Amino acid sequence: VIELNKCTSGQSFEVILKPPSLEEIQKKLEAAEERRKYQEAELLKHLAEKREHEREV
Amino acid sequence: MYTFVVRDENSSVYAEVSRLLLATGQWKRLRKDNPRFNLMLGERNRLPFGRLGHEPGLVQLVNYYRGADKLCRKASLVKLIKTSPELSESCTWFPESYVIYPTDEREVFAYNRRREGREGNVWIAKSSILISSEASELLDFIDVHVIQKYLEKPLLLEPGHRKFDIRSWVLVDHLYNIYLYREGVLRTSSEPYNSTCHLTNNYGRYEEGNEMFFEEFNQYLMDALNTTLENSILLQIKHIIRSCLMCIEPAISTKHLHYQSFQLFGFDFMVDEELKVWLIEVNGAPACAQKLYAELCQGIVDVAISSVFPLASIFIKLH
Amino acid sequence: MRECISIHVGQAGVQIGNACWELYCLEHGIQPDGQMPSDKTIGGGDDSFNTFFSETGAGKHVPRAVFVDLEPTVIDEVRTGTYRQLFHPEQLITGKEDAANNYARGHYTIGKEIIDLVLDRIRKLADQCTGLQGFLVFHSFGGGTGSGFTSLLMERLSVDYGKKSKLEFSIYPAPQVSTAVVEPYNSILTTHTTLEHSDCAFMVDNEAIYDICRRNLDIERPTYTNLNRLISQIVSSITASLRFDGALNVDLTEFQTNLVPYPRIHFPLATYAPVISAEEQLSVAEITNACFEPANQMVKCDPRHGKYMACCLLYRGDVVPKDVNAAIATIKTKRSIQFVDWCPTGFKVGINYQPPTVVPGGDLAKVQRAVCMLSNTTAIAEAWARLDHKFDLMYAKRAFVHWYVGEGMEEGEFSEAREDMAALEKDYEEVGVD
Amino acid sequence: MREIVHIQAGQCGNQIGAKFWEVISDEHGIDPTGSYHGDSDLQLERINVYYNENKYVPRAILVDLEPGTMDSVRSGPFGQIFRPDNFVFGQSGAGNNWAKGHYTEGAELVDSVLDVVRKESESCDCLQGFQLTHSLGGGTGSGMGTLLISKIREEYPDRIMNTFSVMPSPKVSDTVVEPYNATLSVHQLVENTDETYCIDNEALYDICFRTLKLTTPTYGDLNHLVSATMSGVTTCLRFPGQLNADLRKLAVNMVPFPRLHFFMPGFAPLTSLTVPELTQQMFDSKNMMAACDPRHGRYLTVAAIFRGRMSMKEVDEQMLNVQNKNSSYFVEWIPNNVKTAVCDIPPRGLKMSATFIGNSTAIQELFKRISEQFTAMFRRKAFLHWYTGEGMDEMEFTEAESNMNDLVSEYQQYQDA
Numbered sequence A: 001v002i003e004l005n006k007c008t009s010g011q012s013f014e015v016i017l018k019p020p021s022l023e024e025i026q027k028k029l030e031a032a033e034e035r036r037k038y039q040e041a042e043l044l045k046h047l048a049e050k051r052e053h054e055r056e057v
Numbered sequence B: 001m002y003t004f005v006v007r008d009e010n011s012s013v014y015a016e017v018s019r020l021l022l023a024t025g026q027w028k029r030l031r032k033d034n035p036r037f038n039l040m041l042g043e044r045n046r047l048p049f050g051r052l053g054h055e056p057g058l059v060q061l062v063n064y065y066r067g068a069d070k071l072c073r074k075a076s077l078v079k080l081i082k083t084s085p086e087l088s089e090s091c092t093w094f095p096e097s098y099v100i101y102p103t104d105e106r107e108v109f110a111y112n113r114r115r116e117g118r119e120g121n122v123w124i125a126k127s128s129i130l131i132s133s134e135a136s137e138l139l140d141f142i143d144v145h146v147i148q149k150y151l152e153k154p155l156l157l158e159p160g161h162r163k164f165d166i167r168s169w170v171l172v173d174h175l176y177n178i179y180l181y182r183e184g185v186l187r188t189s190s191e192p193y194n195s196t197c198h199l200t201n202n203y204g205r206y207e208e209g210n211e212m213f214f215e216e217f218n219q220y221l222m223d224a225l226n227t228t229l230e231n232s233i234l235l236q237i238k239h240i241i242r243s244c245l246m247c248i249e250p251a252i253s254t255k256h257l258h259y260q261s262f263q264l265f266g267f268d269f270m271v272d273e274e275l276k277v278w279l280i281e282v283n284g285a286p287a288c289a290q291k292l293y294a295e296l297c298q299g300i301v302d303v304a305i306s307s308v309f310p311l312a313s314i315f316i317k318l319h
Numbered sequence C: 001m002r003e004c005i006s007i008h009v010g011q012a013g014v015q016i017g018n019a020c021w022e023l024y025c026l027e028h029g030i031q032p033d034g035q036m037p038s039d040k041t042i043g044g045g046d047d048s049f050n051t052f053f054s055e056t057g058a059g060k061h062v063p064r065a066v067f068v069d070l071e072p073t074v075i076d077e078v079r080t081g082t083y084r085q086l087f088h089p090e091q092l093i094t095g096k097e098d099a100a101n102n103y104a105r106g107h108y109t110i111g112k113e114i115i116d117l118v119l120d121r122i123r124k125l126a127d128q129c130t131g132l133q134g135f136l137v138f139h140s141f142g143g144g145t146g147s148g149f150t151s152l153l154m155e156r157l158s159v160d161y162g163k164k165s166k167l168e169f170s171i172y173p174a175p176q177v178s179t180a181v182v183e184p185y186n187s188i189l190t191t192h193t194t195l196e197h198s199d200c201a202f203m204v205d206n207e208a209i210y211d212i213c214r215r216n217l218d219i220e221r222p223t224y225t226n227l228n229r230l231i232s233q234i235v236s237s238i239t240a241s242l243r244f245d246g247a248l249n250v251d252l253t254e255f256q257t258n259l260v261p262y263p264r265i266h267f268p269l270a271t272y273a274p275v276i277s278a279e280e281q282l283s284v285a286e287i288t289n290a291c292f293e294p295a296n297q298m299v300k301c302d303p304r305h306g307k308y309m310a311c312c313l314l315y316r317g318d319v320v321p322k323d324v325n326a327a328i329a330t331i332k333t334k335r336s337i338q339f340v341d342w343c344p345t346g347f348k349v350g351i352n353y354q355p356p357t358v359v360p361g362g363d364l365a366k367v368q369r370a371v372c373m374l375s376n377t378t379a380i381a382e383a384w385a386r387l388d389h390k391f392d393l394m395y396a397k398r399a400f401v402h403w404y405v406g407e408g409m410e411e412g413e414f415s416e417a418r419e420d421m422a423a424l425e426k427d428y429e430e431v432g433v434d
Numbered sequence D: 001m002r003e004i005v006h007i008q009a010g011q012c013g014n015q016i017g018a019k020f021w022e023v024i025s026d027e028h029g030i031d032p033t034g035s036y037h038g039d040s041d042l043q044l045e046r047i048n049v050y051y052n053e054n055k056y057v058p059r060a061i062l063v064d065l066e067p068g069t070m071d072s073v074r075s076g077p078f079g080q081i082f083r084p085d086n087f088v089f090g091q092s093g094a095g096n097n098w099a100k101g102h103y104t105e106g107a108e109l110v111d112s113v114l115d116v117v118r119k120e121s122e123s124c125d126c127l128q129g130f131q132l133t134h135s136l137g138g139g140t141g142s143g144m145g146t147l148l149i150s151k152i153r154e155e156y157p158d159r160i161m162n163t164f165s166v167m168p169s170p171k172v173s174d175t176v177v178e179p180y181n182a183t184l185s186v187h188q189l190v191e192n193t194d195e196t197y198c199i200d201n202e203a204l205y206d207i208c209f210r211t212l213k214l215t216t217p218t219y220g221d222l223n224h225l226v227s228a229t230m231s232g233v234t235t236c237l238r239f240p241g242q243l244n245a246d247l248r249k250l251a252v253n254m255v256p257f258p259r260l261h262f263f264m265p266g267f268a269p270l271t272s273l274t275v276p277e278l279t280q281q282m283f284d285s286k287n288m289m290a291a292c293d294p295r296h297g298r299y300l301t302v303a304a305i306f307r308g309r310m311s312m313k314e315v316d317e318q319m320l321n322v323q324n325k326n327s328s329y330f331v332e333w334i335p336n337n338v339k340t341a342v343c344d345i346p347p348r349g350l351k352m353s354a355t356f357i358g359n360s361t362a363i364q365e366l367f368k369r370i371s372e373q374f375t376a377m378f379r380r381k382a383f384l385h386w387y388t389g390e391g392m393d394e395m396e397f398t399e400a401e402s403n404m405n406d407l408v409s410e411y412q413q414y415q416d417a
C-alpha cells in the first residue's frame, strides 16, 4: 500500500503485488477539393457533349 | 435449421461430425468464411476466437477452448504442472520433467544426484526424440524441448514382453462437464522390450493394428494379474483427467462468455509394472481408432452440439 | 486548478454530451438555469468543479463545452431541452447538410468549410481559461461527422494547442443499432488519422452497452436514451477525478502516465459495476470481482487471453481501502491477471465517497457503492481485429469506395489506414503474447 | 437535407404520381384543399420534405407533352392541391416515341420545366434532390424524363436523383416499340440516377391477377399497388427516424458500385396478420415488383421498412431469422448489409405493413428480357423509321444495346464473386 492520500471527498492509493503543420493540412484539404473540382469539370464536359449531340439530332 | 462452418479439412473426427450433422437434415454447412454460423469446427492454428459471439441473434459455439494449448504442448504442460499448486513440482503422476531451451531449467536438470545415488538415470528428450542415460547426449541433441524421466519399469504385455501407452478420449462441453469416453485404446509395441520397442506411436501380430481395446486388456488384467482395468488403472486415469482439467478451468471456461466452447482431448498415459499410471501427454487435436469413430462422433453430437442446439451414454461423467 | 474543454461531435457525440452534462449538473448540485446554491464564491473561483464549469457574474455555471454537428436536428434538441439555459449560442454549432455516413464528406468536403468556425468557438473558451489542460472529445467511429470531422479537428487542435492533452470517448459500431454499412471504413479511416493526435481513448462498443441494458436493466429493445444514460455514468466515473477533490487522475496528463506506457496502445478497457434495474446491496468484493467479468465491460473481449499494462480502480460510495485490498487479494488467487514483464503488477485505486447519482426516472437503481475499472489490456485488440476483417471483406471488392473517392479522397488513403491498423494489431500482439 | 422536389412525367408518371400524392397526403393529414386536419405530431415533423407551406402544397411538378392526363389529374381526387403554375404541358404528344420526348417535341418544352424546377429549388432551405416518376416504355416519361434528368444533373450536379421507373412488359403493353424506348432510357438512368426503383408492369399485373385475384386488372389497380409501395419506400424520408433518413444516406447504404443502383421493391401483406407473416412475405418473390427471382442472384444490400405498432424486439428477431436462414442469398463480402427501420404510422386500411427494397443481382433478368425484345426487332430494323424520322441514327441504338448488355455483365460479375 503506497501513496495513501486522504481528503474529505475520498482517498487514493496504490497496491503493488509484484515489481518487474497548418500548411500541410491546408494542402491536403485543397488537393482533395481540386480533385472534386476536376471530376465535376469532367462531368460538365460530358454533359456538354450530350447537349451538342441533342442539337445535331 | 442450424448452420455450421468447417475450417479444418484434415480433421478425421470433425469430418465425421460434419457428415453426421448433415444427415440429421437439421444442419446446413455454410461456406467457411460466412460469419452467420451457429457452430464453428475451427482450424488448429490462429482460430480467430476474437470474431466469435458478435453476431446479433446467433448462439455461437466452437470446438476448441481458447487457452487449452497450455495443457497440450510439452513445455507448457511441464510449466503448468510445476507452477500450479494443485498440481505442483511434486505431482506424483507426472514424470520428473525440465524445460530446456537450445527460463531454461538446464542447471536444475538432479541428474548428478541420481548418478551419485546409483539410481536408474535414463531420460527422454522430446518436443512438439532421443532416449539416453547420458546428460550431454540429451543436451547436445537439443542444441524448445523437455527432458523427462524415462519410465524404465513399464508394465509389459504377455505374450511378447511388450510396452504400450493408453489413449483416453475426453470431451469437455460448454458447461465444463468432463466426459470420458468409455472406450480407450492401448497402442502396443510388437517388439520385445530391451533395456522401435521403446516408442508406441512384427507389426500387427498380437492384435490388429497394434491396438488392444479395453475388453481384452481387462480380460488380460484379470487372467494374469488378478485385478481389473477399473481398479488398477481407470481410477488413476479419471483422477488425472479431472485434476488437469479443473486446474485450467478458470483460465478457459466459457461460462460467462459471449461465445461458448467445447473440445475433444486425447490423454496419453503410461503404466508402470506396479500398476501406477503416469500422464505423458495431452493432445489438443486427437484422431480416433478406426472402429471407434462412429460411436465417439455421435457422442460428440449428442453431448457437445445437440445440448446447445436441440433437434426436433457412451461417456463417464467425471464429477 | 486547470480547465478542461469538452467537444461533442456528431449525433452520438452530442447526445452523449447532453447526458453527461445533465449528470454533471446533478452530481454538483447545479440547476437547469445554471445556478449552484452551494457555490459561495459568486462570479468565479478555482474549485475542482471549475475545471468543467465557468461562472458568470449572475452566478450561472456554464459548461466548458462546444457541440458541433453538420446538420441541425440534434443540437436543436440541446437548444430547446431541459438544460438549454446552461449554454450560449456560440457553444452550439450546426451546418445544414450532414456527412451522409461518409468520412470523406465530413473530413474533406464539409470539414473544410466549418473547421475555422469551430476553432474560433473553442478559442473563445480557451481564452477564458487560466491554465487549460486540454480536451475531451466525444464522437462516433461510424458517422461521417463523428469520424471525418473529428479527425480533422484533432489534427488542427494538435497544431493550435500543441502542448495540450486530448482524450477521446469513442463509440465503436454495432449492427444492432448502426445506421450504415460503411461504418468499418469510417472507423478505420478516423482511427488511422487520429492515432497520433490522441493521448488516451476510451472506446465504448454499442454492442456491449446494448447487452448490458438488455440483461441487467431488463430493457427488451434499448434506445439511444437508455444507452446514453449508462454511458454517461461510465464517463462520469472516468472524469470524476478532474471535477472533485482527490489525488488520483487529477489532470489529463496523469491519464496517460497511469494508463498508457506506449503511445499507440492508448485504448484502455472500461468495466463498470454494478448495473441494477430501478425495478440487494453488493459488497466491495463483489463489485471488484465483477470488474473481471466480460459481461460488464464496455467492449466484449477476453482479458484472460492478453496482458495488462496498467489497471486503475475508481470507486464511488461507501468503500474503505482495507476492503479494496482484501478484495484484490481474493481475486488475484481466483483469476487470470497477467501483466507484461516491464510494468509493475498492481492497481491504482481512487475512492470518491459520494455514491453515484442517478437521473430521476432513469433505468438505473441507486446503489451504495460502484466501481469503474480502467485496464490497459491487449485483449481490447480483439475489437480492432473484428473491424479490420469487416473492412477487408468490403475493400477487397472496393464496395462503396466510389462514394469516398467522389468527395476527393484518394483510394490509397484506404490502404494506408489499413496498413496502420495492421501495424497496430501487430503492436498489441508483440506486447501481449509469448 | 430537407426538401425533395418531385417531378412526374407523361401518362404513367402522372397517373401513379397523382395516386402517390393522394396516399401520402392522407398519411400526413393533408386534405385536398391543402389544410392539415390530422391527430399526431409525427405527421408534421418532416412535412417540409415533400410540401411547401396554414396550407401545405406538394413540391411537385407535373409534365406532359399532351394535355389529357393532366386535365384528369386536375379533376382527380387531390387534383386541386397542386400548384397551378407547376403544370407544364405541350399539345403535340410524343407518340410513344423516345426520340420525340428526348430530342424534338420534348426539347421545345424542357426549358419551361426547368424554370419551374428552379423556382421550387430556389425556395428550398437545403435541397436534397429530386424524385421522378415515369414509364420507360412510352415517349414523354421515357424520352423527355431522361432528358430532364440530364438537364437537372447539369444544373444541380451535387444533388441526389431518384426515380420510380415503370419498365414495360409485352404482357401489359401499349405498343411494340416499348423495348426500344426502355433500352434508350436505361442507358440514361445508369449514367444519371443515384437510385432507381424498378417497377415491372408484368409483376404488378401478376400480383393483381394471381395473388389478389382481380380477374381483370386495370392500370388503376396496378397504380394502387405502386402508390402503396412508393408510400412504403419513402416512409424514412417523411417521418422521424434514424436510418436511410435522407436520399444521400440511403444511397450510401444501398449502392456499393455506382452503376448498380437499380432496386427491386416489395410490399407485404399481399394476400387475396403477424410480424413473422410480414417478414416471410416481404422476402418472397411473389411480393416483389420487378419480376425477377431473387433466388437467381444475390442481395448486395437490403432495406426493410415496417409500419404500424408491433414489437420492435420481434421485428429484430424475424429480420435476423430470415438472414441467418437463407444466408446464401446475401453476398458475404458486405457485412451487415440488411438494415431495418420501423415507423409507427401504418398505411391506410392495414394494422401493419412492410416494404422491401433490395439491390439484387437478379435484377439482371429484367435487363436481359428487355435486351432480347430489343434485339428481336432491331436485327430486322423493325419500327426504326419512327426514330430515324426524328433525326436519330441506328448507331445510337447499337450503343444503347451495348450499354445495357454491359450492365448485365456487371451484375453477373458480382453474382459469382
Ligand SMILES: */C1=C\C(=O)C/C(C)=C\C=C\C(=O)O[C@H]([C@H](O)NC(=O)/C=C\C=C\C)C/C(C)=C/[C@@H]2COC[C@H](C1)O2
Residues within 6 Å of the ligand: D023, D212, D224, D225, D227, D228, D267, D269, D270, D271, D272, D273, D277, D347, D348, D349, D350
Ligand atoms: C387502396 C385500396 C382500394 O382502392 C381498394 C380497397 C378498399 C382495398 C384494397 C386492399 C388491398 O390492396 O389490400 C392488399 C392485401 O390484399 N391485403 C392483405 O393482404 C391484408 C391482410 C392480410 C393478412 C394475412 C394490401 C395493400 C396493397 C394495401 C394498400 C395499402 O396502401 C393503401 C392502399 C389502399 O391499399
Ligand SMILES: Nc1nc2c(ncn2[C@@H]2O[C@H](COP(=O)(O)OP(=O)(O)OP(=O)(O)O)[C@@H](O)[C@H]2O)c(=O)[nH]1
Residues within 6 Å of the ligand: C009, C010, C011, C012, C013, C015, C016, C069, C070, C071, C098, C099, C100, C101, C102, C139, C140, C141, C142, C143, C144, C145, C146, C147, C171, C172, C173, C174, C177, C178, C179, C183, C206, C224, C227, C228, C231
Ligand atoms: N451510443 C450511441 N451511439 C449512437 C448515438 N447516435 C448515433 N450512434 C451510433 O453512431 C453511429 C452513427 O454515427 P452518428 O454519430 O449518428 O453520425 P454523425 O456523427 O452525426 O455523422 P453524419 O450524420 O454521417 O453526418 C452508429 O454506430 C450509431 O449506432 C447515440 O446517441 N448514442
Ligand SMILES: Nc1ncnc2c1ncn2[C@@H]1O[C@H](COP(=O)(O)OP(=O)(O)CP(=O)(O)O)[C@@H](O)[C@H]1O
Residues within 6 Å of the ligand: B095, B124, B126, B148, B149, B150, B151, B164, B165, B198, B199, B200, B201, B266, B268, B270, B280, B281, B283
Ligand atoms: N517418460 C516416458 N517414459 C517412457 N516412455 C515414454 C515417455 N515419454 C514418451 N514415451 C514413449 O514415447 C511415445 C511417444 O511420446 P510422446 O507422447 O511424447 O509423442 P507423441 O506426441 O507423438 C504421442 P500422440 O500421437 O499421442 O500425440 C509414448 O507413447 C511412449 O511410448
Ligand SMILES: Nc1nc2c(ncn2[C@@H]2O[C@H](COP(=O)(O)OP(=O)(O)O)[C@@H](O)[C@H]2O)c(=O)[nH]1
Residues within 6 Å of the ligand: D009, D010, D011, D012, D013, D015, D016, D094, D095, D096, D097, D135, D136, D137, D138, D139, D140, D141, D142, D166, D167, D168, D169, D172, D173, D174, D178, D201, D204, D219, D220, D222, D223
Ligand atoms: N403501371 C402503369 N403503367 C402504365 C400506365 N399508363 C401507361 N403505362 C405503361 O407506360 C408505358 C407507356 O408510356 P406512357 O406513360 O403511356 O407514355 P408517355 O405519356 O409518352 O410517357 C407502357 O409500358 C404502359 O404499359 C399507368 O397508369 N400505370
Ligand SMILES: [Ca+2]
Residues within 6 Å of the ligand: C039, C040, C041, C042, C043, C044, C045, C046, C055
Ligand atoms: Ca464559485
Ligand SMILES: [Ca+2]
Residues within 6 Å of the ligand: C158, C162, C196, C197, C198
Ligand atoms: Ca499530441
Ligand SMILES: [Ca+2]
Residues within 6 Å of the ligand: D108
Ligand atoms: Ca413546335
Ligand SMILES: [Cl-]
Residues within 6 Å of the ligand: C160, C161, C162, C163, C164
Ligand atoms: Cl499549447
Ligand SMILES: [Mg+2]
Residues within 6 Å of the ligand: B281, B282, B283
Ligand atoms: Mg502429441
Ligand SMILES: [Mg+2]
Residues within 6 Å of the ligand: C010, C011, C071, C098, C099, C143, C145
Ligand atoms: Mg448526423
Ligand SMILES: [Mg+2]
Residues within 6 Å of the ligand: D011, D012, D138, D174
Ligand atoms: Mg400512353
